[PDB]
Design a protein around this ligand. Structure first.
Ligand SMILES: [Mg+2]
Ligand SMILES: [Mg+2]
Ligand SMILES: [Mg+2]
Ligand SMILES: [Mg+2]
Ligand SMILES: [Mg+2]
Ligand SMILES: [Mg+2]
Ligand SMILES: [Mg+2]
Ligand SMILES: [Mg+2]
Ligand SMILES: [Mg+2]
Ligand SMILES: [Mg+2]
Ligand SMILES: [Mg+2]
Ligand SMILES: [Mg+2]
Ligand SMILES: [Mg+2]
Ligand SMILES: [Mg+2]
Ligand SMILES: [Mg+2]
Ligand SMILES: [Mg+2]
Ligand SMILES: [Mg+2]
Ligand SMILES: [Mg+2]
Ligand SMILES: [Mg+2]
Ligand SMILES: [Mg+2]
Ligand SMILES: [Mg+2]
Ligand SMILES: [Mg+2]
Ligand SMILES: [Mg+2]
Ligand SMILES: [Mg+2]
Ligand SMILES: [Mg+2]
Ligand SMILES: [Mg+2]
Ligand SMILES: [Mg+2]
Ligand SMILES: [Mg+2]
Ligand SMILES: [Mg+2]
Ligand SMILES: [Mg+2]
Ligand SMILES: [Mg+2]
Ligand SMILES: [Mg+2]
Ligand SMILES: [Mg+2]
Ligand SMILES: [Mg+2]
Ligand SMILES: [Mg+2]
Ligand SMILES: [Mg+2]
Ligand SMILES: [Mg+2]
Ligand SMILES: [Mg+2]
Ligand SMILES: [Mg+2]
Ligand SMILES: [Mg+2]
Lengths: 261, 181
RNA sequence: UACCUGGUUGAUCCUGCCAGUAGUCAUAUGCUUGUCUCAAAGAUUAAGCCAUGCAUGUGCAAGUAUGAACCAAUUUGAACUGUGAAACUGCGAAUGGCUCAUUAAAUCAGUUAUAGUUUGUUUGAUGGUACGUGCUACUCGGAUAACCGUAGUAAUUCUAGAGCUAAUACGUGCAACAAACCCCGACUUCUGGGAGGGGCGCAUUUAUUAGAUAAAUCCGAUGAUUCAUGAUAACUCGACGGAUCGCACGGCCUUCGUGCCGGCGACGCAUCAUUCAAAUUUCUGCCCUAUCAACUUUCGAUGGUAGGAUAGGGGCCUACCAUGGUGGUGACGGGUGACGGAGAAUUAGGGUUCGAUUCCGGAGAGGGAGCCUGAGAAACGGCUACCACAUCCAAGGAAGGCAGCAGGCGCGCAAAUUACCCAAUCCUGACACGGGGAGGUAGUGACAAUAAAUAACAAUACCGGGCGCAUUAGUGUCUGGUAAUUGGAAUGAGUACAAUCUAAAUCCCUUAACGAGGAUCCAUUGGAGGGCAAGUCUGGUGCCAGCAGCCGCGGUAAUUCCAGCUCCAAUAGCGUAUAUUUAAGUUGUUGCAGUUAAAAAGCUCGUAGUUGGACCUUGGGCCGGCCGGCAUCGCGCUCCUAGCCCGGCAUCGUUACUUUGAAGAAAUUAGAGUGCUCAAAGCAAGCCAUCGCUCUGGAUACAUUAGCAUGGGAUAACAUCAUAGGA
RNA sequence: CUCCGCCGGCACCUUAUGAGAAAUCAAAGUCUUUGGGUUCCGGGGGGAGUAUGGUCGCAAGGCUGAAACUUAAAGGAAUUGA
RNA sequence: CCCGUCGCUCCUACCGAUUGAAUGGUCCGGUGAAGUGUUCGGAUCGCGGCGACGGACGUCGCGAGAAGUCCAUUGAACCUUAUCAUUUAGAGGAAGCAGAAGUCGUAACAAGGUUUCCGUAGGUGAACCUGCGGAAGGAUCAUUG
RNA sequence: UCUUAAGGUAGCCAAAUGCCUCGUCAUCUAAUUAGUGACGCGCAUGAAUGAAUUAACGAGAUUCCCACUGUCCCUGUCUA
């Protein structure tokens, strides 16, 4: 039409928001922000629909305008903020930290972390290039721009950032054999170790990953995300250690949980 | 305008050939012998049977070791076993095709009341259902097509408010009593 | 449920249609209607016309206050202290909503691309020189609304003038080094210089130069660039580089001087990136029509070059040149009662028909056309002009746009309230407070869909079939019923204390007392010849009235009409009309037929099209329990994957087909879990001692065609080692 | 000219084990156990090979070719009777 | 059983002089509102330089700035012709159908009383007749008698 | 049924051929004895006395429409 669309209808909402169908006509319409806004969750979905600390739009407004809800080292009072992958959401009054990760079935969990693994975050880089006066800088998929990059940190790689020094402390070089976890598509959620990476001139680079227990799959580059060097992750995985389990297997889990009680 | 989005569908289908002696008298056999309100209830039963048999037919079309086969084969079989609609040692996914509308009609709550006694008639069973006289665990049920599961079958019993099995006597009782007193 | 039935005949076997049969989230209508849940509703005809009212405005501690108010109230110094209505300023009004008129490779879907672009905002990072002869900043302008006052006009958020007073409105204007380097350049000593002093932020444009290799001291990206970026010479009458606003005070004297100072924010300028997007754009795909075979091109058609314009590519436009572009693989043209898609109905499979409509995209706001502001508009709840329509006029003038909500007229077979509300879902603003006919709630609502009442149970009876002997009886078991017979039980329809529900009521769910004698708390719709279920009943009519989908009935004994009894099918539903699906193997690719039932061209040639004979090693083995790897009579590999000399390595014919993988919007459908009491549904909810919390789920599938990617080479097309110009 | 055999012709006689509504057919078979390739062509009977348009022809006419409306049968094969 | 003409009633469509008519579009040309951009233009309004002059004056500093106007460009809207398409009128001519209890015949079905019929040509009130060639869907599957 | 040698065929028409006649109907016009197109029992149409059409052409005859005009309303004036 004749400008930006400022309403979002619940059915048009991303499928991983889980939100119901007769709940209304409209959805939170996540504001423009630092993350892709189709791969994100508004802090209203973080508060009302997952943690249930409120029960209405206006009560979530009270939550956020109290200045309690602090994201990534700094309080964000916007109620449609596109919080997404490894954004850390802290609450001083509850002294309670959360970190937003994919779970194996393609959705977002809020995994609790203690303070030491909440002092910092971890994100991949979009691309590193020069700027004014020849000073190099790199761009992350969180949008952050970092100047004077370590001369070895390259594109597609991963970098840890503290919230006080607010710069790089270490980086994982995206390469063969380091644990990744896909962040988009049908394979999203599953962690695994890269086992192969083939490139075709002029198209998306394909990443073949193997899970911790035998299964193998493939993914496009924009979706994969190294976590740690080697098999060991540098982040606390959720209750499913990044293994997507077949529906038969997950039926057996619930059957066994039934027959164990 | 939301609430347009709440789905809804049809539950039976009127038969193809309207006037057949064979089908007409077979359906009267069933309706009278289960004491039903009309033949709409019967036609819902053939509709549910048609649904489950279509699913089972498509499942049997495939071959074993196919994860789609195993999953909703097992789902359909556990649904049947929860409704007790198959017997023990009979889970084969073909005995689902074998079953017929008598099986569903036999699980309706009227029938279960009749077979547990407590009715003295199947039409008396239906009415007792609709005058709030019967609960299942604790909740009084008034839908004679309640389709009881076997895990609820054992303790289908009167309400705590019906005059027969619960508390105070009914309004006819209390009129007769107060005019006697 | 992958189905048939009546009608050509004296009868038979057919081709064959006619009629029957069933559905429609498919409309109208007719009859009828007690309860619960759910919920389409002026699309088809008129994208016809509109009275009235509303639908977009906005206020924080943080841009502007003794202009006029309210609350504090003054030691009568200063505040305007605190609440602020009006107004300036800023932002939004480019979303929402409504409709489907125009539009048939166009929009649209899947899939690309922007290295060919703009993007308020978010988020993150970022920013010297304003002149001083680069030797540390150098000065503060009135006027304007609101108010007060004088007015025209019949008049409208029509309008002139006087007096006041602000800025984060407007307009000026202080600048943080060594100058790093760049070019001039006195003289010294001779210079390869010392150089004394004179010229240089960031954006804009132009131009130069760099932005590095290959085996016997080179340093970013791409699949791909003169890319990112740097240096230079300049260039602009430079947009910019903060004269802004909040609280909390609180270490310490240099002149003990609000004193040296200092943090946390709000707003704002510009650059880059991000994001919200947009705009273009690649490939493939759309209904009927040949009584639409040529269309385009002087005047843009197709391309080239140069430019202009755009944010940007581009005949988008201009000048010149070339003579091209599309088509029997259907162009151009015409129809469409044609917005596209997700999808809907029906479906054994395949299909057929539909899709105005709540989700996405596009297009319009009576019909065209043109623009302001703004980041965003060719906006219409913005303007300008014309045309059609129409309102007020005090007769000069003025205001217009319901295909927004509701409502009125008309058109029609056809479609409800001029209601309530911001509480939910979200949007919006300067913003925790305002606003929101978006959206929700309620009234009409047999559109469609769900559960589902209208009695039940007992002995009595003329009775009615065995069963206890079953003769010879007689009464006997489930009770079968004509029983308004007799009888006490059960209840919700309804009424209703109350509570609950609700933004407030209302409904539902609970439930004080009331609420059944069978006449009522009364079920209808259609039919009773065949199909097709149910009268060789009775009365009336007499080829009439009429019925009848078709075959047929009615000419005084009507199974067919009009009536009553009885009955039947469905049952709170059913009939009727049209359209459409099935039937229909009567559109047939699966899957029809052409001797005679409709249909082989009179016959041959013939281009496209369709279809195309056979032939090419995985031939035999090991090996371990459908396949890895092996060897045999395996063109080589240097390089990443590369053995405890060595598996499994690049480039040097295409496709189809096929396997697997990725990406694939939800809603719809299939389908997992889940006792809304069931069910349609919904996405919840379930268990703790159901005492200050646990466990959570919110699966999964499908998605043909086009595109990308991996394994195979059977099958099928194309191209082609005989000139050897071969290896 | 007699005999025997090959092909390629034009046909014929007998039989279903086939096909067909049958009449009949050794090709009208190898068809619901439905798929060698290809062209033309039919969708109940009329209106009608008509009107209109096009096109060819000296003309007669040829090729291409509807609709409205109407109708419940028209038609094929065989049986008996008259 | 049955074919056609003629007579009558009704329905549907056809041809048809009428420079037929109406509605809606499209193209060329004429005229051209309005906006945007552009040229001149300069109503007033800003240090109110200087005369060292008595709130005034001229030399005034340049910058703003409206009406108007010029030229382009987009271009509504009207007008004339052409033409397309959809409906509609038409004296007369002539088809098809349906109806009825009509008139004239006897064409066809048997060897239908002249075997039928196909193509073509001519004629006749009507069916039809005849000429030339063809077919059997014939009344002959047959001349070694 | 009389009669002829034969009984006006194909066509065509109030035609330059139709007396009745200003034929009847439609069209054109405000109004039409005119024009065209049809109707034909045609005083007295008609087939090489050639019949019916017929594009082009015509100092041929007739009707209408547009432009144009002192032909006219209605005259005035100028020049040789
Ligand atoms: Mg919109
Ligand atoms: Mg079928
Ligand atoms: Mg017949
Ligand atoms: Mg008969
Ligand atoms: Mg039918
Ligand atoms: Mg429409
Ligand atoms: Mg309108
Ligand atoms: Mg160019
Ligand atoms: Mg349309
Ligand atoms: Mg839409
Ligand atoms: Mg618009
Ligand atoms: Mg507009
Ligand atoms: Mg409006
Ligand atoms: Mg309205
Ligand atoms: Mg009745
Ligand atoms: Mg009747
Ligand atoms: Mg009757
Ligand atoms: Mg019957
Ligand atoms: Mg009827
Ligand atoms: Mg009948
Ligand atoms: Mg057929
Ligand atoms: Mg034939
Ligand atoms: Mg032939
Ligand atoms: Mg060929
Ligand atoms: Mg036909
Ligand atoms: Mg016959
Ligand atoms: Mg005869
Ligand atoms: Mg004869
Ligand atoms: Mg004969
Ligand atoms: Mg003759
Ligand atoms: Mg003769
Ligand atoms: Mg014969
Ligand atoms: Mg004559
Ligand atoms: Mg005459
Ligand atoms: Mg005249
Ligand atoms: Mg004449
Ligand atoms: Mg004569
Ligand atoms: Mg004569
Ligand atoms: Mg002669
Ligand atoms: Mg003569």
């Amino acid at each position: 039409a004749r400008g930006l669309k400022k309403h979002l209808k619940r059915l048009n909402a991303p499928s991983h928001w889980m939100l119901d169908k007769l709940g209304g006509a409209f959805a939170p319409k996540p504001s423009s922000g630092p993350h892709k806004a189709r791969e994100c969750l508004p802090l209203i979905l973080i508060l009302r629909n997952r943690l249930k600390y409120a029960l209405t739009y206006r009560e979530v407004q009270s939550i956020l305008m109290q200045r309690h809800i602090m994201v990534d080292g700094k309080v964000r009072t916007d109620k449609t903020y596109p919080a997404g992958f490894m954004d850390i959401i802290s609450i001083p009054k509850t002294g309670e930290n959360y970190r937003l990760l994919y779970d194996t079935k393609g959705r977002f969990r809020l995994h609790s972390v203690r303070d030491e693994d909440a002092k910092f975050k971890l994100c991949k880089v979009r691309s590193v290039q020069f700027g004014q006066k020849g000073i190099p800088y790199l761009n992350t998929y969180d949008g952050r721009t970092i100047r004077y990059p370590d001369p070895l940190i390259k594109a597609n790689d991963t970098i840890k950032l503290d919230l006080e020094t607010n710069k790089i402390v270490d980086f994982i070089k995206f390469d063969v054999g380091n644990v990744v976890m896909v962040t988009g598509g049908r394979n999203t959620g599953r962690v695994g170790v890269i086992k192969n990476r083939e490139k075709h001139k002029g198209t998306f680079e394909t990443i073949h990953v193997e899970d911790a227990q035998g299964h193998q799959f493939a993914t496009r580059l924009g979706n994969v995300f190294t976590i740690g060097k080697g098999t060991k992750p540098w982040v606390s995985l959720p209750k499913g250690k990044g293994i997507k389990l077949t529906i038969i297997e997950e039926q057996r889990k619930r059957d066994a949980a039934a027959q164990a009680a | 305008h939301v609430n347009f989005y709440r789905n809804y569908g049809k539950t039976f289908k009127k038969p193809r050939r309207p006037y057949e002696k064979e089908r007409l008298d077979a359906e009267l056999k069933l309706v009278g012998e289960y004491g039903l309100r009309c033949k709409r209830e019967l036609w819902r039963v053939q509709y549910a049977l048609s649904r489950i048999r279509n699913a089972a037919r498509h499942l049997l079309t495939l071959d074993e070791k196919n994860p789609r086969r195993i999953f909703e084969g097992a789902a359909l079989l556990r649904r049947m076993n929860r409704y007790g609609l198959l017997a023990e040692g009979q889970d084969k996914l073909d005995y689902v095709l074998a079953l017929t509308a008598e099986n569903f009609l036999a699980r309706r709550l009227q029938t279960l009341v009749f077979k547990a006694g407590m009715a003295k008639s199947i039409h008396h069973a239906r009415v007792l259902i609709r005058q709030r006289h019967i609960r299942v665990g604790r909740q009084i049920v008034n839908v004679p097509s309640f389709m009881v599961r076997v895990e609820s079958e054992k303790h289908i019993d009167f309400s705590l408010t019906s005059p027969f099995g619960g508390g105070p006597a009914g309004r006819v009782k209390r009129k007769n009593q107060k005019k006697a007193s």
